[PDB]
Amino acid sequence: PQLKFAMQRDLGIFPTQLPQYLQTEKLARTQAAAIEREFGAQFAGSWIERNEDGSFKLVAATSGARKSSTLGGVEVRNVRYSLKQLQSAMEQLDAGANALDGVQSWYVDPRSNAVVVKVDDGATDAGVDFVALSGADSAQVRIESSPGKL
């Protein structure tokens, strides 16, 4: 009820769109492990995504050639790097920081098939030096400017 207002106000989810969204949220939860099991070593993550028309969908990425899934309701997206590859780059970044003015945060981002390094507006250079010293493959990492400060 009072949550519907917030959902419509902050997420643009109108009452009639609630059921389909909920069905997708549940599907993402119930099928997560099954999707990972199916894509094997080439698994590249899964997430709930909103379509331009307002509907929601479950997307699963793979670094393989697979173009479909045995489980229904799953859109397969072909990407370059596997989750394992991105996770390795992520660990390198953690290690680099463990031994960073301007760098806000970093994380594996399956939706963009890359490890994201957020930096304060105007600190991209700091992000560049960080990635370089970390020894992370620059092709697997993407620097993104972020307003404000952590």
Binding site: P1, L3, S46, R111
Partner: protein, 198 residues
């Protein structure tokens, strides 16, 4: 006092934070919140009255803590939302892209979606790993506050974010927000706590 997620509490009469969730450790009452909110033994007050003390905390590295309360406190399975509240039904973690909302004494009840998991934040005090990022806005004071789904599944407690000079990131589009929270289950597991549900 009534222990509800999202309400304000003070630490050592010096700083402010928001209650995460009512929990129990056997017969002991308590609530989880952010580690950066207080050091072990720090005194927690609600409405000016002492309600408990920080029993344990980890920050940086992680950003978690729980306050052991006096038997007089009233634990409720809720998270504040305006004049009403959201009932806490469980702690099932939602997927990336799932709609989630947070409650705190500064910005109140705000919603967005989970945008990333296992995030390492470069906080001034030191890095904190394993955080979840969402795009609901937040502000100074909301820290330690509840993050929960629409169906009442507790997700975690507010850890930090890219706030602006005004103290919050509600002034920028959700697409540019980095609102981070510490996952709930690892806190419950590390301290042997059970989430109060309804």
């Amino acid at each position: 006092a009534n222990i509800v997620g999202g309400i304000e509490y003070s630490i050592n009469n010096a700083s402010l934070c928001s209650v995460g969730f009512s929990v129990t450790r056997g017969a002991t009452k308590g609530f989880v919140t952010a580690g950066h909110c207080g050091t072990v033994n720090a005194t927690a007050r609600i409405g000016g009255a002492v309600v408990g003390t920080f029993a344990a905390r980890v920050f940086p590295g992680n950003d978690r803590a729980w306050v052991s309360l006096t038997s007089a406190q009233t634990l409720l399975p809720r998270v504040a939302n305006g004049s009403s509240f959201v009932t806490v039904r469980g702690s099932t973690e939602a997927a990336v892209g799932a709609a989630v909302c947070r409650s705190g004494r500064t910005t109140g009840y705000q919603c967005g979606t989970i945008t990333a998991k296992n995030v390492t934040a470069n906080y001034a005090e030191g890095a904190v790993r394993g955080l979840t990022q969402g795009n609901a806005c937040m502000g100074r004071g909301d820290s330690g506050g509840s993050w929960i789904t629409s169906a009442g599944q507790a997700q975690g407690v507010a850890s930090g974010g890219n706030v602006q000079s005004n103290g919050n990131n509600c002034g920028i589009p959700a697409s540019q927000r980095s609102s981070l929270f510490e996952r709930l289950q690892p806190i419950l597991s590390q301290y042997g706590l059970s989430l109060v549900t309804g």
